[PDB]
Coordinates of C-alpha atoms in Angstrom, one line a residue:
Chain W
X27 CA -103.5 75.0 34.2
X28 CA -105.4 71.4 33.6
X29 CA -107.3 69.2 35.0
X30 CA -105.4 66.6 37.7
X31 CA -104.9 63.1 36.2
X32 CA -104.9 59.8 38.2
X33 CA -102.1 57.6 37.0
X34 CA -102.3 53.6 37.4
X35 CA -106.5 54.0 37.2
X36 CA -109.8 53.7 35.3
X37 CA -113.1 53.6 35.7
X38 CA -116.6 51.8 34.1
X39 CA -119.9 52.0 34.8
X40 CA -121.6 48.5 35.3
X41 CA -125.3 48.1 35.5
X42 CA -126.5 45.4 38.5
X43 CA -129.4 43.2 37.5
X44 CA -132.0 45.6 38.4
X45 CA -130.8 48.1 35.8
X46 CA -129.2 50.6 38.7
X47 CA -126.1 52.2 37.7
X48 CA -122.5 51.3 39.5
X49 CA -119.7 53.5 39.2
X50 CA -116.4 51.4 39.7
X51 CA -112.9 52.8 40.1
X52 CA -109.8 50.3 39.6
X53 CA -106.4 51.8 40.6
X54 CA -103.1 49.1 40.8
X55 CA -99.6 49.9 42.1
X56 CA -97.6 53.1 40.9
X57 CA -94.4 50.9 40.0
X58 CA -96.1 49.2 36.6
X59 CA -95.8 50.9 33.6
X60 CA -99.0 49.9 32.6
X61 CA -102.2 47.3 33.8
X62 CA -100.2 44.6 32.0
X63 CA -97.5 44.5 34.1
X64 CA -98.9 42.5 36.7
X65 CA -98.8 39.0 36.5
X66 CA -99.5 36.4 39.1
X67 CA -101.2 36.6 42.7
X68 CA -102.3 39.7 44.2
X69 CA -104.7 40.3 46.6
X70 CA -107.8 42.9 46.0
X71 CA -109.8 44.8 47.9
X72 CA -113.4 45.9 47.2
X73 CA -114.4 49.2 49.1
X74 CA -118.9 50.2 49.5
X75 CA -119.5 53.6 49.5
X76 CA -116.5 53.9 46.7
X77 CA -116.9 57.6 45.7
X78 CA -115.8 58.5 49.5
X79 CA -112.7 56.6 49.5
X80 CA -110.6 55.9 46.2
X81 CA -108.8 58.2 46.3
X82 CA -107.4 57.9 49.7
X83 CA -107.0 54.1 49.8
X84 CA -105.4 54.3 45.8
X85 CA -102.5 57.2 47.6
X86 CA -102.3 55.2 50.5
X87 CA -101.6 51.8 48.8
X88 CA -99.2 54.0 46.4
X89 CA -97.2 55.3 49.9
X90 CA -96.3 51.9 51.1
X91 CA -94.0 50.8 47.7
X92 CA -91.7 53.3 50.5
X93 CA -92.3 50.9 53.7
X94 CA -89.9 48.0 54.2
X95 CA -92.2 45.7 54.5
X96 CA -94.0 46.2 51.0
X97 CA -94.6 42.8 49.0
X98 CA -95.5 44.3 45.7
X99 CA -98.8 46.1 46.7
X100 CA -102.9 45.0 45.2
X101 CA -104.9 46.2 43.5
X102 CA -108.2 48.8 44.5
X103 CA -111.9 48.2 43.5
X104 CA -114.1 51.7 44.8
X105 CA -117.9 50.5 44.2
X106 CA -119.6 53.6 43.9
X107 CA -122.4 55.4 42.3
X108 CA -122.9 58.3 39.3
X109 CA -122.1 61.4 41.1
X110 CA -121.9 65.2 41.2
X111 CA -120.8 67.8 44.0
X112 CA -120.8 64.8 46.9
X113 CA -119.3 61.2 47.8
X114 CA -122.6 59.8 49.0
X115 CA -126.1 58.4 47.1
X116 CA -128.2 58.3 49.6
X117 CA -131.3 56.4 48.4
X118 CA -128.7 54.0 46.8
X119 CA -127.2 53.0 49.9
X120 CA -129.6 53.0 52.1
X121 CA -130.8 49.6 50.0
X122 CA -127.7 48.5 49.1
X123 CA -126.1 48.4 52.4
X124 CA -128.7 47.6 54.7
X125 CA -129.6 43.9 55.3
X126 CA -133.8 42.6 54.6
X127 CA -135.9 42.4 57.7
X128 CA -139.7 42.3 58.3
X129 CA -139.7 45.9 60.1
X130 CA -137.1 47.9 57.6
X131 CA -138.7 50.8 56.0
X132 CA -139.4 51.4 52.4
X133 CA -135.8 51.7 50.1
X134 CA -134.0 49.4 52.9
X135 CA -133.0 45.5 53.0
X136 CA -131.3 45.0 49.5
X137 CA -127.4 44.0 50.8
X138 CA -128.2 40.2 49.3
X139 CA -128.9 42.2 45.6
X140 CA -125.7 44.2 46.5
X141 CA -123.3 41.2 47.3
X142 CA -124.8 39.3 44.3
X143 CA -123.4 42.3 42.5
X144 CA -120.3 42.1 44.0
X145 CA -119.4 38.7 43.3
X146 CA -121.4 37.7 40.0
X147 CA -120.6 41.4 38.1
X148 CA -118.1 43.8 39.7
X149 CA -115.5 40.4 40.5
X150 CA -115.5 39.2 37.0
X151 CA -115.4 42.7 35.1
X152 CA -112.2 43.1 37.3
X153 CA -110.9 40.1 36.8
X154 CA -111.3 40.4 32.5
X155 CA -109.3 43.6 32.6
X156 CA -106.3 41.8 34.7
X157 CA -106.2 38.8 33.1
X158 CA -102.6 38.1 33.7
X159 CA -103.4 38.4 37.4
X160 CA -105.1 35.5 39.9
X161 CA -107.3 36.8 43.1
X162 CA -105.0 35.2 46.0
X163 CA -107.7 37.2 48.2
X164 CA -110.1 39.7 48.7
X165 CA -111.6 41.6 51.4
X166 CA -114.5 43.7 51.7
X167 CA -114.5 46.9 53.2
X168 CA -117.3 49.0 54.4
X169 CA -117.9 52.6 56.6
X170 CA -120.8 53.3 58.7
X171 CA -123.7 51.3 57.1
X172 CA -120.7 49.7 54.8
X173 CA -119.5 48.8 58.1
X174 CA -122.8 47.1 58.7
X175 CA -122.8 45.3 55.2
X176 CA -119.4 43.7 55.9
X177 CA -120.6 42.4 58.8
X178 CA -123.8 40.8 57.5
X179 CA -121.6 39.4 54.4
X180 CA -119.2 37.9 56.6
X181 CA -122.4 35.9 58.8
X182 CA -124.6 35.3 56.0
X183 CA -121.9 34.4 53.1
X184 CA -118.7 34.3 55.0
X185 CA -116.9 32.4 52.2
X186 CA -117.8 34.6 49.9
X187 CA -114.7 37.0 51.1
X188 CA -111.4 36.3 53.2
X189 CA -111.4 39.3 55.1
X190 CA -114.2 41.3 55.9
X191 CA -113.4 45.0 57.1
X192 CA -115.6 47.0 59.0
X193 CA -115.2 50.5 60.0
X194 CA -117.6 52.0 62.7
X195 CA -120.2 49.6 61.8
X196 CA -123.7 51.2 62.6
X197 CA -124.8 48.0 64.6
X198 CA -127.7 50.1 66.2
X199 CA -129.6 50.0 62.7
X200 CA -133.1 48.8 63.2
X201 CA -133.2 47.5 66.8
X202 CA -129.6 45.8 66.6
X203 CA -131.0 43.7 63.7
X204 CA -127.5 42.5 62.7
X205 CA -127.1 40.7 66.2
X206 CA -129.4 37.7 65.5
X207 CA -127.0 37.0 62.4
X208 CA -124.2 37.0 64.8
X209 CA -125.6 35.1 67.3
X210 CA -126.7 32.6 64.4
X211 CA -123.0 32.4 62.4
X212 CA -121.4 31.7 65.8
X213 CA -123.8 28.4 66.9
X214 CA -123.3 26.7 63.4
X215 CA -120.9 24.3 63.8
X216 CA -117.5 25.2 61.2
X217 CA -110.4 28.1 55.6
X218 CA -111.9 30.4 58.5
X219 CA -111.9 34.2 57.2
X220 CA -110.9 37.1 59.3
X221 CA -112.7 39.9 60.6
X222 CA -111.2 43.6 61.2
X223 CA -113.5 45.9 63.6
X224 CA -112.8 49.6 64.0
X225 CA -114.5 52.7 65.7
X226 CA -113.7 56.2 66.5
X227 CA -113.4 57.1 70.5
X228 CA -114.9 60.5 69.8
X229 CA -118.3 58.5 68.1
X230 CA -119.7 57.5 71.4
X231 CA -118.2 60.3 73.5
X232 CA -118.1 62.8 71.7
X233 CA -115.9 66.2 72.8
X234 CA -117.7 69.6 72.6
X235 CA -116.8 72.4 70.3
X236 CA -115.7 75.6 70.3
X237 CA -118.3 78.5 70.7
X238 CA -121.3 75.5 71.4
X239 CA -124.0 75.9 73.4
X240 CA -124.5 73.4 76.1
X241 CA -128.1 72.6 75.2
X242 CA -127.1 72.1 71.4
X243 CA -123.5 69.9 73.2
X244 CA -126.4 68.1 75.4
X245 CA -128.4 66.5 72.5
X246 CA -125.0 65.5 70.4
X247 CA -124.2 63.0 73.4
X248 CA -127.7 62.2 74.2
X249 CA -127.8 60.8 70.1
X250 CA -124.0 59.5 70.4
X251 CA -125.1 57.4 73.4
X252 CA -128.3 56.2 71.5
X253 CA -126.2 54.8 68.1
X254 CA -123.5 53.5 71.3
X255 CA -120.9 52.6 68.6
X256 CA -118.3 51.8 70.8
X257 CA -119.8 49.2 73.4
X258 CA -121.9 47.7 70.7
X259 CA -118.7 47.1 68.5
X260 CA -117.3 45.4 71.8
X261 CA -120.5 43.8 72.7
X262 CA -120.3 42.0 69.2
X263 CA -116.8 41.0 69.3
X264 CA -117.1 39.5 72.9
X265 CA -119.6 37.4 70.9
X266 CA -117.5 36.7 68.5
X267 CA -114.1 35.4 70.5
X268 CA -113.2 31.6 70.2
X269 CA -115.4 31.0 67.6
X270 CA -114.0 28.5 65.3
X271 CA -115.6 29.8 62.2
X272 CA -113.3 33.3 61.8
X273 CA -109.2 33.1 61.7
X274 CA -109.0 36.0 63.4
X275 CA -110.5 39.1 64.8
X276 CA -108.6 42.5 65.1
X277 CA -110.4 45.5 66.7
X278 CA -109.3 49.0 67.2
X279 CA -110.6 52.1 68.8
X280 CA -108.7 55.1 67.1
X281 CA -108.0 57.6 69.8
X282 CA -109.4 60.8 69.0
X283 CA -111.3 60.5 65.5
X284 CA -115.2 60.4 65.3
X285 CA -117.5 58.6 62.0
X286 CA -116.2 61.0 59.3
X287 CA -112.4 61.1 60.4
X288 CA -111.8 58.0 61.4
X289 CA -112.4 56.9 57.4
X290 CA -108.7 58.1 56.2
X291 CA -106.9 56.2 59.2
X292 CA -109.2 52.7 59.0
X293 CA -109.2 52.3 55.2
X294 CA -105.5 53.2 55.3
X295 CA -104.7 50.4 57.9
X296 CA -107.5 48.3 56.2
X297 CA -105.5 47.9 52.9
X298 CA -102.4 48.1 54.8
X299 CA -102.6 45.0 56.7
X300 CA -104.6 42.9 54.2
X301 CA -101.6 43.7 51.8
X302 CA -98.6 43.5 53.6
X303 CA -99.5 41.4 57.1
X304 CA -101.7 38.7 55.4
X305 CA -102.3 35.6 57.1
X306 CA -103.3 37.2 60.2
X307 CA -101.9 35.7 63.5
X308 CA -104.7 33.3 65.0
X309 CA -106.9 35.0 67.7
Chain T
X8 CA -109.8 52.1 29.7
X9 CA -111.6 55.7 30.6
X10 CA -109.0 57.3 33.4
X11 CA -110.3 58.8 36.6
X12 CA -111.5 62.0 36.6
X13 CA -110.3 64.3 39.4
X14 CA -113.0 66.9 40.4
X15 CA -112.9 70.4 41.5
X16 CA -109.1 70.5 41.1
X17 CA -106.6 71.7 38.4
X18 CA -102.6 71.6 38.2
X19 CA -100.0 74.0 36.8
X20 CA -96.0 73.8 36.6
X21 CA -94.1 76.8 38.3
X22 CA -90.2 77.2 38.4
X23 CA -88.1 78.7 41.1
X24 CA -85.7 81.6 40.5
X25 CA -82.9 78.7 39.7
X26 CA -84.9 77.5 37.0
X27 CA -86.2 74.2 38.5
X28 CA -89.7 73.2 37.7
X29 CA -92.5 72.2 41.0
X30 CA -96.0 70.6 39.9
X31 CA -98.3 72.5 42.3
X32 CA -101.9 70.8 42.5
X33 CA -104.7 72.4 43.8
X34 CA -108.3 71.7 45.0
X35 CA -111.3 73.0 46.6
X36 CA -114.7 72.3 48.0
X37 CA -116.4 69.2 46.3
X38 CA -119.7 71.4 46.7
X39 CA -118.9 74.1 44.3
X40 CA -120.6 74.3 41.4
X41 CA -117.0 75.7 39.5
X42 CA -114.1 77.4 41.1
X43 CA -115.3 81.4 40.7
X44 CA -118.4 79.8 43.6
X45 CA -115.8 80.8 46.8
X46 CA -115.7 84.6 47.6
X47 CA -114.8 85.8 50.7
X48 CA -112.4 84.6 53.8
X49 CA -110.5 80.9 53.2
X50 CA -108.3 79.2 55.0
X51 CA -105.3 77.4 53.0
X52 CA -102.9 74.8 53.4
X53 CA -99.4 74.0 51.6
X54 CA -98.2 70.5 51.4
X55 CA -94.7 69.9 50.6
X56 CA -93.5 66.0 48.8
X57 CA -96.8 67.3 47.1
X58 CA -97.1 63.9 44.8
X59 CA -97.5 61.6 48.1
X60 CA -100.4 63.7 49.6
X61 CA -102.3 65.3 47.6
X62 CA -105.2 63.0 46.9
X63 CA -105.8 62.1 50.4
X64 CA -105.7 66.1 52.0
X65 CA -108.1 66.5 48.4
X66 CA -110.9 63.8 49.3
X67 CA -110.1 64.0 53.8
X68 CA -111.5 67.8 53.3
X69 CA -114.3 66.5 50.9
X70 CA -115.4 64.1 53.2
X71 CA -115.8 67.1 55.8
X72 CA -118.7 67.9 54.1
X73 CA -120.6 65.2 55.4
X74 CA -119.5 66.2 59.1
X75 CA -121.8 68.5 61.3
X76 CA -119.2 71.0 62.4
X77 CA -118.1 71.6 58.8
X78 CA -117.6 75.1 58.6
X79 CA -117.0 75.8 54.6
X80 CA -113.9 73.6 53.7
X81 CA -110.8 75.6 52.4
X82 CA -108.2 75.0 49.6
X83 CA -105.5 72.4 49.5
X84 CA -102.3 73.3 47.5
X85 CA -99.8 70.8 47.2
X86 CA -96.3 71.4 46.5
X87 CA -94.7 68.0 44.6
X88 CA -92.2 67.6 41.2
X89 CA -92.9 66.3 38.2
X90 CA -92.8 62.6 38.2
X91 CA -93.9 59.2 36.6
X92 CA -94.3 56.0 38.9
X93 CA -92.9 57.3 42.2
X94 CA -94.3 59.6 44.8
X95 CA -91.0 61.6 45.9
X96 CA -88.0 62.9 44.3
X97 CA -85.4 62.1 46.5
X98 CA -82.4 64.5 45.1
X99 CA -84.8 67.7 45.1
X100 CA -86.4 67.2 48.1
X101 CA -83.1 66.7 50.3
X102 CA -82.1 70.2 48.9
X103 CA -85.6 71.7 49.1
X104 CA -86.7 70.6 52.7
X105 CA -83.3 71.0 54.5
X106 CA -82.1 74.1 56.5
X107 CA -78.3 74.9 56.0
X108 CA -75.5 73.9 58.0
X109 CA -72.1 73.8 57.7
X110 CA -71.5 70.3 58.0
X111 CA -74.6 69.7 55.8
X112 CA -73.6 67.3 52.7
X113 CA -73.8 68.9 48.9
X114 CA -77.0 68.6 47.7
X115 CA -79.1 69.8 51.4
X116 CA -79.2 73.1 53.2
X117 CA -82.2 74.6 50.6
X118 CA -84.9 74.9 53.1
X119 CA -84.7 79.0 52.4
X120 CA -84.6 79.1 49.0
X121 CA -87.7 76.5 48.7
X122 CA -89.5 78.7 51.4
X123 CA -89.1 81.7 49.6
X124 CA -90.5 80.4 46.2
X125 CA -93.7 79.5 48.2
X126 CA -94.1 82.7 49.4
X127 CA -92.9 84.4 46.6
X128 CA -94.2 82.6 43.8
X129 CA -96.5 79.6 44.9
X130 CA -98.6 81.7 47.3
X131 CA -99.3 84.6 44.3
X132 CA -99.8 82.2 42.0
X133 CA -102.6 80.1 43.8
X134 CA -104.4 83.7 45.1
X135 CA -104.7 84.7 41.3
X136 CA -106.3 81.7 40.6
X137 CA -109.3 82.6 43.2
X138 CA -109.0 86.3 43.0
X139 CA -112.8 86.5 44.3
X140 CA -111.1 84.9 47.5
X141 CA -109.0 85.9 50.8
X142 CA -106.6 84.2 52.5
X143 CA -108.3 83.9 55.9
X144 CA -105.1 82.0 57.5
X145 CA -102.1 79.7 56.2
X146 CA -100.9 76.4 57.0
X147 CA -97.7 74.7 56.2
X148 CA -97.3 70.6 56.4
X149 CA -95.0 68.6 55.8
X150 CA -93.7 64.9 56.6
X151 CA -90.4 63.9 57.6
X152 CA -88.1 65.7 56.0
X153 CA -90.6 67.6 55.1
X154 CA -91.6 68.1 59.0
X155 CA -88.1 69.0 59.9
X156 CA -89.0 72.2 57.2
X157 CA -92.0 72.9 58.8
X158 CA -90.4 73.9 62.5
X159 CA -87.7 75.1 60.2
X160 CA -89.9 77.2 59.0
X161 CA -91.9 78.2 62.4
X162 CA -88.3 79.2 64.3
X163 CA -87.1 81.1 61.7
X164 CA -90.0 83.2 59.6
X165 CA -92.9 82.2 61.8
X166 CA -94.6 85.0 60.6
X167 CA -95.0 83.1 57.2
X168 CA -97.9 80.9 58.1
X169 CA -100.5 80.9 60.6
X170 CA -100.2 76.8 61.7
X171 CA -97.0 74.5 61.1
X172 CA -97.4 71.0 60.9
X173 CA -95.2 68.8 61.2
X174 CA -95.5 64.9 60.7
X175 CA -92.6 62.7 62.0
X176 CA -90.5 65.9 61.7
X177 CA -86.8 64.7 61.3
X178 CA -85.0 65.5 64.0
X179 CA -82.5 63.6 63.6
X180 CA -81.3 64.9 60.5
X181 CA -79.3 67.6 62.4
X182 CA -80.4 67.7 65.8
X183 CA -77.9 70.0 67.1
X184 CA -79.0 72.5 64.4
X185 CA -82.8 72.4 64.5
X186 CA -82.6 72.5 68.5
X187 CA -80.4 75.1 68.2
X188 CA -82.9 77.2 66.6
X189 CA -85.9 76.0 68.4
X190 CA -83.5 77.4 71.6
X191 CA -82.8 80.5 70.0
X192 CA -86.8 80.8 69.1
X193 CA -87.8 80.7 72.7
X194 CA -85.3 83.1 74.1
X195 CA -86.3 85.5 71.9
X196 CA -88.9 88.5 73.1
X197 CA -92.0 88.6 71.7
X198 CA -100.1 87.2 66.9
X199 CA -98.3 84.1 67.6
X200 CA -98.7 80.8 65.3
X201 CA -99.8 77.5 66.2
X202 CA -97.9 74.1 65.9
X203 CA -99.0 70.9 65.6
X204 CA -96.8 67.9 66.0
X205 CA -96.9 64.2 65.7
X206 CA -95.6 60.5 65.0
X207 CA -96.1 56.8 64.9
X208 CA -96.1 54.4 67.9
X209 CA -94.2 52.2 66.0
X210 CA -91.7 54.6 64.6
X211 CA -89.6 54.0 67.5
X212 CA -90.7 50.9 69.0
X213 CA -91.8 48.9 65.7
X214 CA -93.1 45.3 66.3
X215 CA -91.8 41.9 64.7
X216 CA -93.3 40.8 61.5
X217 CA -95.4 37.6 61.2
X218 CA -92.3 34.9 60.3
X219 CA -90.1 37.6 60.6
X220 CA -86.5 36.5 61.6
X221 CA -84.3 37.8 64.7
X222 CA -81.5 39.3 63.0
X223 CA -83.7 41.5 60.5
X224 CA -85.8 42.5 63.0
X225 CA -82.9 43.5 65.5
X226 CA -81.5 45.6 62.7
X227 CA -85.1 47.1 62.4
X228 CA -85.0 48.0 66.0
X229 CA -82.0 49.4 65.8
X230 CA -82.5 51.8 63.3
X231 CA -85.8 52.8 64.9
X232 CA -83.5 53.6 68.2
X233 CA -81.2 55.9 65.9
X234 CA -83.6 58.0 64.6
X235 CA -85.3 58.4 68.2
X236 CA -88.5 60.0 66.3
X237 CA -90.8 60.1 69.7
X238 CA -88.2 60.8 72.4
X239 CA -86.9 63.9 70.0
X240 CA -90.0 65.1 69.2
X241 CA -90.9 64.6 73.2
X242 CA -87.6 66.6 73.5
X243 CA -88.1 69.5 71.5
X244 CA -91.9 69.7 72.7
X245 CA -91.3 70.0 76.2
X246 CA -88.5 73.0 75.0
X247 CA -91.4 74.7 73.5
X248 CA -93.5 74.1 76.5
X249 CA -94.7 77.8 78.3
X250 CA -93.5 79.7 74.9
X251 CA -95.0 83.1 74.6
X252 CA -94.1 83.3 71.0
X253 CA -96.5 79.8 70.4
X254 CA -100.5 80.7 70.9
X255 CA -100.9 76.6 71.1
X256 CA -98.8 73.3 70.6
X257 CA -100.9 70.4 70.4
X258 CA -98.3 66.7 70.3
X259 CA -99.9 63.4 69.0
X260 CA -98.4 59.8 69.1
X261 CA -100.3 57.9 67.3
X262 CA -100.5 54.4 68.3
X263 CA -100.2 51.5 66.0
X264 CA -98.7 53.4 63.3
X265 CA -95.3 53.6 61.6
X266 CA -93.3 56.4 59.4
X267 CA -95.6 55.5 56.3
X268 CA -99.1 54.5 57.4
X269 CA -98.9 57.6 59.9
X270 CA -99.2 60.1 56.9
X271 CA -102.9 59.1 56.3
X272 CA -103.8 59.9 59.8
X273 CA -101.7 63.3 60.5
X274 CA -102.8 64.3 57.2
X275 CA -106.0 64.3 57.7
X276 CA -106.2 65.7 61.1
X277 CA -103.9 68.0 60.0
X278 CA -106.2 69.6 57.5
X279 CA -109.2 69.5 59.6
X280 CA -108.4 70.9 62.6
X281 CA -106.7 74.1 60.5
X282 CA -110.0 74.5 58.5
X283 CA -112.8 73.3 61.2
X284 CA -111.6 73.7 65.1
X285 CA -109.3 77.6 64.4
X286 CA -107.7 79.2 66.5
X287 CA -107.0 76.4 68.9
X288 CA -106.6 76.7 72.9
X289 CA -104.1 78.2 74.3
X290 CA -101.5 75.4 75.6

């Protein structure tokens, strides 16, 4: 036996201006017969927290060349860390994906740094090894406090990316700090980008397991009804409706997943629709 | 360009008795320090059109790590061909994942064959790899075709695998022959297996396309009516329904999701349930 090799991919480190290490994994569609193959406009998609979720968005942008409605496919950008054993740094991203506020503990607040990054180091190094390709478009996807970071790009930076994805956004983070950044992106006066929202029905209400103790069932809904990921995620996109600044807002609650499983179906769709149903319908 | 690594994984090539060769890919726990770390009970799951899932089931059960109920993990083995810039082999798997009828076209009707050399040969080969480690309980997936092997498989040898899941299962290939042996299961007397069983909202009922026109989305719709992949499955679960032969049939539609972008969702589930929420209630 050997080890398992990942067609259509490759990896580089890249070093942010701080001098922390980035881990970046680039995968393109199955089809080409090598990188150089594409040539043209294809859209791109840049996923926080990269480590957790290559793999599955690279296989599940591979499994639509199969669906009619397939336009050529896009190209995958997993902005991760140096890892062993485990998909998440937790020091890392607990600065990275967090945004700056008077009251944020020690090793939180540096999502400006981290979007800098983005655009002035991890968008260019892509782009120099596709040179044959243009960006038509590129969304940013985050989980959890990725969630969060999309969020805060898209109010603080919001041209900075055309769609801005976020899955299960922990919006409770430091007193519902991300709120006064909404409330300020919607009263500036205004190409709008879009904004995809998406939470698990089992994260606010969650069901009890098997063999669990009521006491020990007790204190998981008492914590799910503290981080209230559901009616915060609808609290925010009531906010949001009408406003002339974003094209269009999609949100979904995916019946029957919590925070960890709901990360296979919402980076799926995430890719899914930015690829293939791109311009959104105007809502 | 450096490729991506795959982690805690390793492939081999195995024929059949006919001489034909399957790439069988197999992973474990992202936490493990090397593969001789699990000793003791597992539980295991087989995944036939291997190529198409096995990245996602891979890093879906590594991301259970990160989830409070996670209970150990368990290996994934997928089942696939060898292949370069496609996920399925279409002549193969029409032999491999289809039982025999006698209206069946040449090339189709292998389901037994295929079953046997993963019993035979696939199952011994992946238990000499951990020989430290027991096979706690076995699960067989499979999508589409590959979901019309699975109940294949449960109505007649369910004895062969603890859980049967089958994605989009289809029905329609032959449904006068796979309801013939799902009647033929239940009126037979009587540990019984679980099955799980599940499909897209929009597998049946698709939507239009942004700009798409009437005529190809008619078509579209009337495709979706032919293949009748809810109101089968519908059919075939309420059959089941009261079985004593069946410890639990759980049926899931899931909404917003079509034939393809379905596979990332009942995938997923799929594995996690098996390894984290065994044996399930009784239906």
């Amino acid at each position: 036996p050997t080890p398992v090799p990942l067609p259509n991919s490759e990896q580089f480190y890249l070093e942010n201006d701080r001098g922390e290490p980035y881990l970046i994994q680039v995968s393109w569609p199955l089809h080409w017969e090598d990188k150089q193959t594409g040539r043209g406009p294809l859209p791109i998609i840049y996923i926080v927290d990269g480590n957790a979720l290559f793999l599955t968005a690279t296989e599940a942008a591979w499994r639509r060349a199969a669906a009619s409605h397939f336009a050529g496919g896009g190209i995958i950008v997993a902005i991760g860390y140096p890892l062993k054993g485990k998909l998440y740094d937790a020091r890392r991203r607990s600065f990275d994906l967090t945004p700056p506020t008077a009251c944020a503990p020690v090793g939180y607040g540096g999502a400006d740094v981290f979007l800098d990054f983005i655009e002035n180091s991890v968008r260019p190094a892509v782009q120099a090894r596709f040179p044959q390709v243009s960006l038509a478009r590129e969304a940013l996807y985050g989980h959890s406090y990725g969630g969060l970071l999309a969020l805060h790009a898209l109010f603080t930076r919001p041209q900075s990316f055309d769609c801005y994805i976020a899955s299960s956004p922990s919006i409770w983070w430091n007193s519902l700090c991300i709120l006064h950044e909404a409330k300020a992106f919607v009263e500036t006066k205004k190409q709008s980008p879009s904004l995809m929202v998406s939470w698990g029905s089992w994260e606010q209400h969650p069901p009890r397991w098997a063999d669990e103790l009521l006491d020990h069932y007790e204190a998981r809904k008492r914590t799910a009804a503290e981080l209230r990921m559901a009616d915060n995620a609808l609290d925010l996109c009531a906010m949001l409706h009408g406003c002339s600044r974003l094209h269009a807002l999609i949100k979904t609650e995916y019946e029957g997943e919590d925070n960890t499983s709901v990360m296979s179906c919402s980076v799926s769709r995430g890719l899914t629709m930015f690829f293939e149903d791109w311009p959104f319908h105007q809502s």
